[PDB]
Amino acid sequence: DFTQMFYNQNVKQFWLPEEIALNGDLLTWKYLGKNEQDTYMKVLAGLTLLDTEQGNTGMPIVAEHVDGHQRKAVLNFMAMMENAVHAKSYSNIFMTLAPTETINEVFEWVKQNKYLQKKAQMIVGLYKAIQKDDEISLFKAMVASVYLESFLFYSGFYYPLYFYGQGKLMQSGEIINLILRDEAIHGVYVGLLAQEIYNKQTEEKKAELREFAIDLLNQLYENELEYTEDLYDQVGLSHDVKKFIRYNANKALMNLGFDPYFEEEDINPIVLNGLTVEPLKDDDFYF
Amino acid sequence: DFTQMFYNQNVKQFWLPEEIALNGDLLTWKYLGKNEQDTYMKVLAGLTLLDTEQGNTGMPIVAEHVDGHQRKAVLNFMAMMENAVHAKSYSNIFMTLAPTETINEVFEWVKQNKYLQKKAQMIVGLYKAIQKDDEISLFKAMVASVYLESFLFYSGFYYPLYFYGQGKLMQSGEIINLILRDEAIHGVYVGLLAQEIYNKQTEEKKAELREFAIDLLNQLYENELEYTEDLYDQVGLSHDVKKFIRYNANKALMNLGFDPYFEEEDINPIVLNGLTVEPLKDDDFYF
Amino acid sequence: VPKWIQLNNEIMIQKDGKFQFDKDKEAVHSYFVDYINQNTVFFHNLKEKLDYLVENQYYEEEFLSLYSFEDIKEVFKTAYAKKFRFPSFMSAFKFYNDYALKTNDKKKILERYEDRISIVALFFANGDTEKAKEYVNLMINQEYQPSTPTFLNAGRKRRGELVSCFLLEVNDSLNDISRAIDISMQLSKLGGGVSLNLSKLRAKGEAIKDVENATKGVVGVMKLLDNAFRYADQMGQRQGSGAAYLNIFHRDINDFLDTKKISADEDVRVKTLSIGVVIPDKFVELAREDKAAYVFYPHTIYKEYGQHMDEMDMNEMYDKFVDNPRVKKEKINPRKLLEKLAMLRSESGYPYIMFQDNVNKVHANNHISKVKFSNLCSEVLQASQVSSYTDYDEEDEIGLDISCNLGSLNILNVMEHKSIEKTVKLATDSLTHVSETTDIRNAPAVRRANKAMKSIGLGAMNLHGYLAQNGIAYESPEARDFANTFFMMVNFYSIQRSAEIAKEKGETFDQYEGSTYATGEYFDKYVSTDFSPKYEKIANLFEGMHIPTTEDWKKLKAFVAEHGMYHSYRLCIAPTGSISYVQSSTASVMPIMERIEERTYGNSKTYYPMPGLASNNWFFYKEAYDMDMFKVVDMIATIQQHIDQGISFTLFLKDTMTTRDLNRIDLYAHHRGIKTIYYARTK
Amino acid sequence: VPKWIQLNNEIMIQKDGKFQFDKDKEAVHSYFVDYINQNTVFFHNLKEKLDYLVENQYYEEEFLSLYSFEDIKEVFKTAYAKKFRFPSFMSAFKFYNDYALKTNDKKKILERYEDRISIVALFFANGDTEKAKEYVNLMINQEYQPSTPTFLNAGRKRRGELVSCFLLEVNDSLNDISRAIDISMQLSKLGGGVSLNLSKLRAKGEAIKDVENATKGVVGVMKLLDNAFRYADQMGQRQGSGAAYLNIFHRDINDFLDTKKISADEDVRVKTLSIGVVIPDKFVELAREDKAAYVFYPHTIYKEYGQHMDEMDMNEMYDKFVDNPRVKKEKINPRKLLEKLAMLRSESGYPYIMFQDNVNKVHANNHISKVKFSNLCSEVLQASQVSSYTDYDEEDEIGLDISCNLGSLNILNVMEHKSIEKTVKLATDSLTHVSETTDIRNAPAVRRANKAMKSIGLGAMNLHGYLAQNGIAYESPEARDFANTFFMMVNFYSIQRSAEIAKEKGETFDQYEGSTYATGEYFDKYVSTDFSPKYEKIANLFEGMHIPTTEDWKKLKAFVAEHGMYHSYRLCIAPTGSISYVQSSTASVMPIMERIEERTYGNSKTYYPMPGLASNNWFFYKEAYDMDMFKVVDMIATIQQHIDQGISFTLFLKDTMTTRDLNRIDLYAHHRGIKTIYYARTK
Ligand SMILES: Nc1ncnc2c1ncn2[C@@H]1O[C@H](COP(=O)(O)OP(=O)(O)OP(=O)(O)O)[C@@H](O)[C@H]1O
Ligand SMILES: Cc1cn([C@H]2C[C@H](O)[C@@H](COP(=O)(O)OP(=O)(O)OP(=O)(O)O)O2)c(=O)[nH]c1=O
Ligand SMILES: Cc1cn([C@H]2C[C@H](O)[C@@H](COP(=O)(O)OP(=O)(O)OP(=O)(O)O)O2)c(=O)[nH]c1=O
Ligand SMILES: [Mg+2]
Ligand SMILES: [Mg+2]
Ligand SMILES: [Mn+2]
Ligand SMILES: [Mn+2]
Ligand SMILES: [Mn+2]
Ligand SMILES: [Mn+2]
């Protein structure tokens, strides 16, 4: 009942980072403190890693196991967006704002950062555990994918949105909003596929799947807290970002058909502000 | 040396089925004989069936085994074009020209056809034989992929190009020309990835891979001749189609860095109308 | 966020269900009181300010020295006597961010609006203090607006050329192509838009010195021109702008159009070069009959006949070219070419369309030459003669290259003051002065044609603003009636001023004797037809103004026959892009694009309601995209019957309009006498 | 497959473990008998052939009109009397595919080798029958090979210029840049390669008319020039090739070098323009000491001192520029720049390296000017003076451009015939005639410099071939001894011929009196040092030939002081690529790249063994990539000490070599007096 409308929405949202000129951010970037620039680079690098694996591994593997040519076409399109559009856009931003050495250093930093490695290990592990014709392993990977789309990106998205909302780094911010617009529909779509599998189960099996989903969310959440503190303490925003990731965790659960898990909190209002051809006939020559 | 350049060329060639209005083809379709309509339907179904294998297996399997983030992104983009753009385009052409019952029957016929099946299963067999961390099996699959993209499609493309060059079925011919333009670049790109593997091999292993490629080409070519007579004798075109197959076989070989196999022939003019850094050590300055 | 920006942003905050249009007066008041009065360099008196400006290489002392300081003081007092106030924030913002003179460090404002107007008036008067005061009254009343080049640069030492529109003919030779590249770079360096005619260049695959398939066609020359315009970017603040025009019957027409396709290869794409196509009536006739057409190789025609293809009448020579074996041609589908043009205009808005027969059936100077192409804005339509740039040490055969300095009447202010005649004559005098003071040192044909033709362009602006502020729909018959009467009067008074100038100076423009002005064929419709308003509502708008009759036109015809005409061209309606904000007027004679214009400057966004926009006249400020393009074509054709040059005519298309709708709009424009079509803008 | 091609392919088929070298003679004989004789037009007599060629617009009738037909017949008999036979298939194939005159349809052969030789000799003799016979004997004996332009075009009506190498100075102005583009296009239209000096252009971010940051730098001009060369690609028969040179101290050096990075953006990347770098000894000294270096903005230096940066002595003015606050400069790392040059040459072979102080420490015409850049082949090193091209209707200040017509001595044939003196003098006469008959009417500086300086380039080829066929290793000290003696003799006889021409014509080259020839400083090393062979084996090679001694050099010095010199520059060893096959010789003085050359012509692959290659001389035909580049540098430095211009020096690198090895080779070449390095070829 939904794939065709998602197909149409995905293809109509198609974009390339080159559509957005980035030289306009040069001055507002120059004006940020060293702490702010450091957090910003690292945040986008963490996002780049997530999209790299979502494009290389997550979306293609889910596409392989989901039945139906139209469902596969949507998932293939989403995969392309992840690595050919999203992951690449971050390099466009980096190449504009930062010198090569700072770019090299931040990519080295992703490799050695323990929270980023842990979250990649956990998510990719679940993708690679999918067994052919085994719907339960597929469900588990789809939960992981929804958590990546609708929860894990948000510790990263906070900062570009926070600046966009203050009228700073608005070209980079425009790119990020386009990425976010895509991930929102990706999270909903994968969520609907996960619910399909969940709804086939006995009540006993469903109870276990909810346990899996909640245990996984909590494990990812605890790691994300440490990641958030590590990045944001130097810019004074860790508590604010934490509220934002809890907000988005609830959205991820909802995408999976589950009740919200965290209590509602006031999000920084700045971040909220951050959000044919037809032929000519003979009569056409007479009036 | 080449992936970013191909990335650029691929994304700038992006297109969607909806861009070409198809209904005006009915004004020339109605004037074709039964044999012409039959051949066109059968050719179209042949292309559709082969392209589906490439979208579901060929491109995604190569993307899976190739190392490199940028290569995986380009390959993902190509897989997207197969599944999201090409497949929808072929379906659109069919739905415009034939009623539902006729489409189902043509696909039943072509699905049972000996020459279409022989080539489809030969290609798919090589994709299924790729082994993790074995570059020889990957190379063999890449050869199969290049043969599909740059050679096997062309016994089929001939007919739409033949009409397109005569002013018949111009809307569907425009679509086919866009598809063909994508397959050409797909073949060239996968060809470069195959040459990379080939160049890492010993001289004996190279000679062995050359023998594999020529042997495979021979098997496919002999079946193409039979496929060609089966479809084109009823419309009197087989001689010219055979010249077009050999010409495209030579292009496929050149994509794989190999010499042409067949002598140069002229093509039907109607179809043509359709178509190591180290630092100085303070002693290098003294002699 | 500055206070004035906060007040301006309150425009869109609807109160009581209606926009707070009164916030713009508050916005402009706060803008002034908090930014402009603070950041204005203070001088004790006019003498000290003028001495500082002249000493610091701001004002040229040549024009100021012609007046005794008492005269300059009187002119400046006249400018300030009006107590002119900008009615909206956007007008003052535009003036003080683009035209107001600022110190070399761009931190302080040396010129107010009155100072700029007084300097421009002194430059125009050329020593005439009373003439300078008349110019000051004309500009301070905002009845006449000098073009952006003249207005910004007049009286400035650093100033660039006061003329900004240049048309160059390119001859079919390497020497001529190199000279064209050089002249294009030289003129772009001056900041003027340069338009080139590529119809004389031989097509791709033609022979050079009995060597076949050697020529690269017009696309290689276009790549050269694109690189030249990219290099001469005018400091980069305004990227170099050039237009290339090609006849539709040129062989390279398909390749010429393919340079603007997004799918085009990068080695063929021309990023910085606008393209216009010249369409003779023969092509439209061929497409209408669905007949197969031919595109000709220009050099074969030139060899067979000793004249260029674009120098001949295609309506008379097409059959001879087709039947001549020595002429090389390839078959095309005229309807397919029209559809391709519509598709390209939808995708990118290109090419500009020039209807050659529409232009030349009313052209007064066909004896000098026919109009073969247009400018970068598509409204300049003048006779041109190609130059023969020979080898070094060989004398060049300098032809005529087109150029005109622009000015715009403010229709609303001209009608409110009932000063059509006086405003038109003063604008003609100022344009003539600008033309006489121009001397291009690296464009021999441009300079020669400026001396010989004395062509000026007097446009108009605020047509839609005036109509909406008077309860008249743009598409209504009354709007066309007013436009007809007003532009007939403008043409009458510009012709009268040109004849008077010719009588006073004793000279006409070169080759005036063979023009339709001299033979009287120009005045046939004016002496035979009455152009007074046919509606009482429109006739009332002209109350207090004398509308010329057939007897007045007969008298003017006799006067011209006696004394001749000083200008070969007088009237052209240019887009008038950024100077319309200063005048608080709608752009040119086009309908408004938006009722409220939302723009982002810096990191703060600003809102610009259309001048005079209010609840009462909200419905009369209909947007162009919501308008029937056939009625817009009708209005432009009504105006065009009184404009001797062209009119920049942008097509405003909805996204739902197919290529057939665009083709029908172009065909109706050609049918209605439209000379050029500028842009295809899609909502 | 052709029978001759099958015979040639039998070369590689090993028989008894040995290459079948005798199969090439059979291959050439079969090629002739089966294709050349069949496709050779038949003429009853020479008179009929000459009439047919003249009437059919194949030959220029003017030069043939200076001889009675009896003399033309005698010259043709002299050419044919030799019964010259091509020793290999590739020689005849190259001649009859590139230089042999063919009918307008390129179907039949109108000229044989003898016919082309006779026509060239008659063109050279300029009406002298005995001189024409001497030229015929020289060319048919293959002792002298005129450059490809002269050999191909001499005596042909539809011919390009006989000079094919031009060097253009570009002044820092828009007029000069546009004129440079025009001249480059005009010269490429003639088929000649154009090298442009961009060191006088101001760097990116410089002020244009007291407006800062307005300049695009040398990269924008580079894009302009690249597009100009692509457009004027010789009617598509040969893509337009140009070279741009920038001094290493120019601020745009890094941007200039980045245009050749593969990863470079297409906007900045230049595709068809070769780039060379001029490195003064100051840069090498700075890099050696690892001291921080500065790159200067040329316009600031010009304003501060009134001279261009490349017109001043960098070794003396570098500290003054660094200490001058009014001179803008950018800190750089000289060793990082050297390593960047090495890596760029490894990846692409660019840039060319010109060691400015090596060129000018021996430059004989420093009074006219220093040598600032080289040509597209990096062997032309002459004084140039920049022209000042002004606005239209102003007078241009025409300077001195660079152009020399080339010819190559066949070292093996000259040594076998013991005719160094006669061959050198005849080649000098022919090059002087080519220079005299050359007149470019669209490059005023080129024409003026050709008339004033009378520069010629007499090169040599078959050095490695001659040495290998005589059992001498290219890297051996004996090879360097032979090169020293041979090129000393060549220089001696070219100087003697230049002095004799000056005496006969009673005229020297412009500003000869200030040259080192006039003051005698040129002959210091020749009058103080002996260059006779130090090895008995090499001394035997010169048996029957007089080796000039110190007394001979003193007599020549006195003769030059009495009579002067006709040529400002005489000797330059150009790459001489295409005509090496016809001459059956190794290209230039470089070592062979491969013992047997595998080429593809159509679908047929041809095998070309190195001329004279055999089993007994296989070891002496060592490939260049296997040689020590230090020994090749030693050889080139031994040769370069007797060449007034440069030697086109290609570096042959193995893929295992790092950038450090390339840098060491460059530094050793600079140490050894090398003037230019042409290409970094990697295997
Ligand atoms: N809308 C405006 N357009 C142009 N200039 C303005 C505008 N508003 C203010 N100014 C300038 O700022 C000065 C101060 O404005 P303000 O309205 O406070 O003046 P005022 O003392 O009330 O009297 P007056 O209007 O006669 O100047 C004005 O004299 C004029 O110089
Ligand atoms: C020289 C040259 C010219 N052209 C084009 C540009 C000109 O419009 C056209 C004519 O060149 P011309 O400069 O006029 O050449 P020509 O006059 O000597 O030869 P002909 O009399 O036969 O014309 O050729 C190229 O495309 N490439 C080139 O390299
Ligand atoms: C006009 C122009 C010049 N230039 C560069 C190229 C020239 O080498 C350099 C000087 O241009 P010039 O033509 O010499 O300008 P100018 O002489 O009027 O200014 P100045 O007195 O400072 O010399 O500026 C650009 O890069 N872009 C341009 O648009
Ligand atoms: Mg010509
Ligand atoms: Mg200058
Ligand atoms: Mn993503
Ligand atoms: Mn996603
Ligand atoms: Mn496909
Ligand atoms: Mn494909």
Side-chain angles (χ1 to χ4, degrees), chain B residues 183-245:
Chain B
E183 318 299 24
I185 197 158
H186 298 172
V188 179
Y189 186 67
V190 177
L192 291 169
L193 299 174
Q195 294 179 51
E196 191 179 86
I197 294 166
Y198 179 85
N199 296 326
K200 295 205 261 66
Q201 307 310 309
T202 66
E203 290 304 314
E204 184 181 26
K205 187 61 71 203
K206 278 180 179 170
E208 193 167 292
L209 292 182
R210 283 202 304 282
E211 175 59 63
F212 164 86
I214 301 306
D215 175 68
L216 180 58
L217 170 72
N218 274 320
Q219 288 304 119
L220 292 171
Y221 173 67
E222 294 290 331
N223 182 73
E224 277 312 80
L225 299 179
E226 299 184 281
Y227 176 80
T228 294
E229 287 173 11
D230 186 56
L231 291 191
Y232 289 102
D233 279 352
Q234 70 193 31
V235 296
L237 301 184
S238 304
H239 175 88
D240 273 336
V241 177
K242 287 169 187 182
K243 299 203 293 180
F244 196 56
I245 294 166

Side-chain angles (χ1 to χ4, degrees), chain C residues 138-407:
Chain C
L138 190 76
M139 283 175 299
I140 210 66
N141 293 341
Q142 292 199 320
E143 298 165 278
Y144 170 68
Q145 172 57 68
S147 73
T148 291
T150 305
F151 195 59
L152 180 99
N153 295 318
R156 292 197 188 175
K157 205 166 262 143
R158 205 276 325 138
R159 86 167 188 60
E161 286 308 335
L162 297 209
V163 180
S164 178
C165 289
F166 303 107
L167 289 73
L168 308 178
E169 295 251 83
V170 191
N171 221 345
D172 187 39
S173 89
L174 184 68
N175 284 341
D176 288 297
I177 282 162
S178 286
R179 187 52 69 169
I181 288 161
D182 166 50
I183 297 172
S184 304
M185 287 195 305
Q186 294 289 342
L187 291 169
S188 294
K189 171 185 186 178
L190 299 174
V194 181
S195 195
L196 293 100
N197 191 23
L198 304 195
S199 306
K200 285 182 171 65
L201 305 180
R202 54 194 77 179
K204 178 204 39 172
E206 292 208 75
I208 316 166
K209 302 274 73 163
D210 66 52
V211 154
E212 277 51 24
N213 220 71
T215 299
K216 281 202 200 30
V218 307
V219 174
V221 178
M222 287 162 69
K223 264 113 72 185
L224 299 161
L225 294 167
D226 184 82
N227 254 94
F229 281 120
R230 200 208 317 310
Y231 175 79
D233 261 2
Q234 313 164 33
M235 179 31 160
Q237 292 186 4
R238 167 134 184 193
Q239 291 189 314
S241 287
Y245 278 77
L246 195 68
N247 203 281
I248 201 151
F249 281 110
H250 200 277
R251 222 289 311 189
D252 286 344
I253 187 52
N254 275 302
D255 319 329
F256 173 81
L257 300 176
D258 291 334
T259 64
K260 282 306 172 192
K261 281 185 168 168
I262 55 198
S263 58
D265 164 37
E266 278 292 318
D267 280 341
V268 141
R269 192 87 192 56
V270 177
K271 281 162 304 331
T272 89
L273 202 70
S274 297
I275 61 157
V277 179
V278 188
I279 302 183
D281 265 16
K282 192 53 173 188
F283 190 88
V284 184
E285 173 198 312
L286 296 170
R288 166 165 65 250
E289 311 145 350
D290 216 351
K291 292 179 179 168
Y294 294 90
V295 285
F296 313 92
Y297 290 75
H299 192 219
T300 70
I301 287 173
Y302 177 80
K303 282 186 315 259
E304 173 66 15
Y305 300 92
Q307 24 189 342
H308 298 277
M309 190 208 335
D310 86 0
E311 229 58 37
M312 274 148 147
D313 191 41
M314 176 66 47
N315 313 301
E316 178 224 338
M317 275 330 258
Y318 175 85
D319 278 336
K320 307 193 184 243
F321 296 158
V322 179
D323 293 333
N324 196 329
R326 278 167 291 318
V327 169
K328 196 184 179 180
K329 70 229 83 162
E330 64 184 17
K331 214 196 267 260
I332 62 150
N333 207 288
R335 288 196 179 179
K336 245 63 180 142
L337 192 45
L338 269 180
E339 298 162 7
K340 179 178 180 177
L341 287 177
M343 158 219 99
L344 207 73
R345 285 174 61 80
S346 322
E347 309 172 320
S348 63
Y350 290 119
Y352 317 145
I353 308 293
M354 155 148 170
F355 295 122
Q356 179 149 55
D357 285 75
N358 283 335
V359 180
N360 289 309
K361 79 190 136 53
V362 292
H363 187 212
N365 297 310
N366 274 334
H367 68 300
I368 301 169
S369 178
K370 304 246 185 324
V371 181
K372 306 140 206 167
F373 71 122
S374 198
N375 67 313
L376 175 64
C377 299
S378 299
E379 103 286 349
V380 177
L381 305 174
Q382 307 184 18
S384 47
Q385 290 178 353
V386 78
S387 300
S388 178
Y389 296 106
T390 62
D391 296 313
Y392 201 91
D393 296 310
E394 256 197 87
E395 277 331 276
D396 289 328
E397 288 134 275
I398 304 310
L400 297 175
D401 275 356
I402 302 142
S403 85
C404 70
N405 65 304
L406 301 208

Side-chain angles (χ1 to χ4, degrees), chain D residues 93-211:
Chain D
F93 176 80
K94 289 313 232 153
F95 174 72
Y96 286 102
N97 280 40
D98 312 39
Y99 308 87
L101 179 73
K102 268 159 218 236
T103 54
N104 324 64
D105 68 347
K106 287 79 190 64
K107 156 59 210 61
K108 279 285 185 183
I109 294 161
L110 282 166
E111 265 176 359
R112 315 303 286 305
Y113 195 58
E114 285 85 332
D115 299 304
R116 183 93 291 252
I117 293 316
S118 301
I119 290 296
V120 173
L122 288 165
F123 167 80
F124 284 158
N126 196 44
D128 195 337
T129 300
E130 224 47 47
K131 191 81 157 283
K133 283 173 202 208
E134 279 154 26
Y135 284 124
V136 153
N137 284 312
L138 201 75
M139 292 185 240
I140 210 65
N141 290 342
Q142 293 197 323
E143 302 162 283
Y144 173 65
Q145 176 53 71
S147 74
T148 285
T150 306
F151 195 59
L152 176 75
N153 297 327
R156 291 195 193 172
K157 172 100 67 212
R158 293 167 289 156
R159 77 165 192 215
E161 282 305 335
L162 295 197
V163 179
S164 181
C165 93
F166 308 96
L167 293 76
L168 301 180
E169 289 264 350
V170 199
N171 220 341
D172 189 34
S173 86
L174 190 62
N175 292 314
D176 294 303
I177 285 161
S178 75
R179 189 56 73 168
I181 293 161
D182 161 48
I183 290 172
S184 298
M185 281 225 282
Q186 300 295 344
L187 296 172
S188 301
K189 171 186 186 185
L190 303 176
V194 187
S195 200
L196 293 107
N197 197 19
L198 306 189
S199 302
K200 289 179 168 62
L201 306 179
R202 43 191 95 176
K204 191 184 65 194
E206 291 219 71
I208 308 170
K209 265 298 163 256
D210 73 38
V211 317

Side-chain angles (χ1 to χ4, degrees), chain A residues 51 82 86 153 179 183:
Chain A
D51 266 317
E82 307 300 32
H86 298 174
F153 274 128
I179 299 179
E183 321 289 24

Side-chain angles (χ1 to χ4, degrees), chain B residues 51 82 86 183:
Chain B
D51 212 28
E82 316 291 16
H86 296 177
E183 318 299 24

